[model samples]
Target: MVTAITIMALYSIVCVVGLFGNFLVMYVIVRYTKMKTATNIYIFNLALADALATSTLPFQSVNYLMGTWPFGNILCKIVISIDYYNMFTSIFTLCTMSVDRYIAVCHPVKALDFRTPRNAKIVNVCNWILSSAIGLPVMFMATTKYRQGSIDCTLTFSHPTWYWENLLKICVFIFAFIMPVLIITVCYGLMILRLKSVRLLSGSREKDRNLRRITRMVLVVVAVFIVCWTPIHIYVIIKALITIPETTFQTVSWHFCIALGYTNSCLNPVLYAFLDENFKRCFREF
Candidate 1:
């Protein structure tokens, strides 16, 4: 029985926590030379994406509490577009991080041969382009329009056909959630098997332990991503396919799912704090 005001209050807390956590993540990575590896580069970019997304939440919280869009059209478009933009960016970067870990562990010689700072930079650039393309449609589609004498900022679709709506939903669910999960699962699964097949000699104990730590961290990250996003996608599917009118409870559930999804932005840095040794040291120094 959470009221709208309560929801906005929760979102405000999430916004502040996410901004500080992600900013700390970025600062630590830049300040420590040891954190400048290929994997950490992806981590830094992921933090950047989360930070961008978190920055928009204060406006969203205010809009929800006020029950209207006080910010004009341009900021509306930018804020709304940023949510999806950073979502895609963060997910894609995590996928790349999984792939990076897979290569580093399963094919160390090849990793040394092919994985370079220049290559990581190129991959990040491409990721930004792809993520931008995925979210750019929202900028064009969203409008600040009058609703019952109050200005509401939202997508202005012109009576979308059922087929188009379902198509877009399917596409988004697959690209943003399903495909990334599949890729991460496969890469990490193979990584585990590869590690098991190779016997660690006494001389390489530290190397073996490092691989295990990295694997655990990546697996946890993917698990958090799936848990946070699955509820929202499930709601989307149910809403589209159920064909039944929603009850007030159902409407409340949908809003709760959306809030839960955004909370992931704050949770990612918490995960790093618990699992990453460098992150722990950085926090201690801070």
Candidate 2:
């Protein structure tokens, strides 16, 4: 129990790495002319969403890691909201990215019509509005307390049945977990079927080349998100429906669930660096 500062160090490591890489992901896409394409509008906004998501890791640490929320209410309101926003937008962005790939691979000609930078920005706008709708409510819920030296932050619920009778968690359950995963899986799953047909029909590996690159990214991003976030989702469902004592060792396990979910946040940038040829080429040219 005394070895608690060590975990702060661990959270710090990801913040440093993820925050730096997150900006770089945003930077490379913006600065490089080659990167300014229709699809990248999604990636740019992804980096944007991830920036907030990644910042919340350290904020998460402070409020929970053996201390009350010392960051004060204003910062707490902002910080906690980012996690919800991150939760919503990350999955939402991936949904769009998956759908973008589907349109690109499944319907090439119409991609020119629908898949424009103009259109991508509008989709990103919708993503924020969707994320904002739920995330805004959570900000107000995290009211602080006056427990001696511990000005603690908390998710205080009102009498309303909808607001905190686990409504937010259940809504997040749909937005962050169930429905989006179903959409992405089906989108990519059908994409694979289409690509498989095309790959065999033309017997031309070269023609299938460009589309496959994007496919790998969507597949990997989807897999990593679902894998990393599953436990957090499970933990939340278990958490909202049931009550638990705060002074238990099982709470430590919940920390692991959170860390796992944030791992996907950090990996958001690293995944692109390793897997994206466009990113590699830009870096090589640098």
Candidate 3:
């Protein structure tokens, strides 16, 4: 009973906070022309993904409290699809944001010549389509099943082949989690080095302030992404390595880790609002 209440309360808070925060970000970014840079465009898409995911959290919270899936199979697939879709999209969007910052800071000439609002839009559209395609399998795999005398929504592997399951898990871990983190790390690392060199070369107060503001925003976003997601990916790898069924303690830990993962959606808006002066100003106006 205590566990159920805790999960219910946690998800409820996430739903309310995440949905409002992400929507506000979208609104502020759209309304303020000054905030509509290439980096902000990437942020808009990221908020969109978070908003969509947050919209599904209410259903999940209710499902958890009910201890069964009363929404039937169709909505089950929809919820599961959105969950995975946004998980991939959020990470991909973060990676894209890092690359954008890197190019803009590290190669100003190339950025001015090639990186535009239009290109950002095109890239985001491709991101959405590609993420949807990657997540499409969830719709077919997720279904209602009888478990412990209640209908539960879960992934139902048709073949039930351990080798295939393990292979897929490894692929997802490598592509979705590991590779993206490395890319973000390298891009930001280089950007930081370049910015320090700029600080030494320029020696102008105004220029330094501008550079520091943008650098801080980029660093905060990347740092928050890494901190929030590391636990869930660690749990994924651990689960893949283990063969036995989950003990009570394992189940509790898994739930906690997943809840922490979902909390990342809520944190992005706060991070932006606090770290970016433009976002902060726009948010105050709104």
Candidate 4:
């Protein structure tokens, strides 16, 4: 049996890596005036969201090692709420990024208005509002229960009904996973069609060079997003529909799913910031 201490140690490594990488991303975007592209606006917010989620992992790692939460009920709710907040912000921003890139590829003229940093910031504010609507309620309602000297933090209601829990699960599945994936995938599909045509190469040489630099990074980051998020959502959706009997396999896999999802935040910095030719140049400059 893998000891809980070892498991938490593994998870702790991810916490620092995630914090360092995502924090670096946030700093790089803020430090350089040259990095102030429209895409970076969303990327900056993504880093912030990633860092917020990363900050909570240490709390969870402690929970695992100690076998219970030492934190009070309020802190648990705050941490969990931020976790879900990170999910919605991360995916929705990625979804918007795809649309921005699609406009750049498919309709360059329209991209003048669509792909500006001003518009991106506006969209980010909108995303924060919507994400908050879903995420903030969790802290208000999430409660902790005690059983046999152990503590569990979960959503509890005075009136037990399938409707409330289902609503939360369904909301999470749709907004955090399904809808954003569809938008991102579809935008990329259309971008592929546009790219395959000869019309793209005829564009301005310098513009093409810069666009190529960022586009590759954008595609890779989105690919990682899909890879990291799918397993967790698959598990969550399955659990939502039918109760699964507890087993070693199920328990271990659940932990893996969560860890994979958290791992995506750290990967985003490498895939987006460090991999980009422009970002790399600026990194060397500074």
> What TM-score does candidate 1 reach?
0.93
The local lDDT score (0 to 100) that residue 95 gets in candidate 4 is 89
Encode model 2's per-residue lDDT on 52-77: one tens digit a residue: 87777777676766567777789878
The number of clashing residue pairs in each candidate reads 0, 0, 0, 0
RMSD of each: 2.2, 2.8, 2.2, 2.1
Residue pairs clashing in model 2 are none
Better of 1 and 3 by TM-score: 1
Whichever of 3 and 4 has more lDDT, that candidate is 3
Model 1 residue runs over 4 Å out of place are 1-5, 158-164, 201-203
Error of 4 at 269 (Å): 1.2
What would the per-residue lDDT of candidate 3 be over residues 20-81, giving only the tens digit for each residue? 89889888888777777877788888899889888998787777666788888899899989
Give all candidates' CA lDDT scores: 0.84, 0.79, 0.82, 0.81
TM-score of 3: 0.92
TM-score of each: 0.93, 0.89, 0.92, 0.91
Tell me the lDDT of candidate 4.
0.81
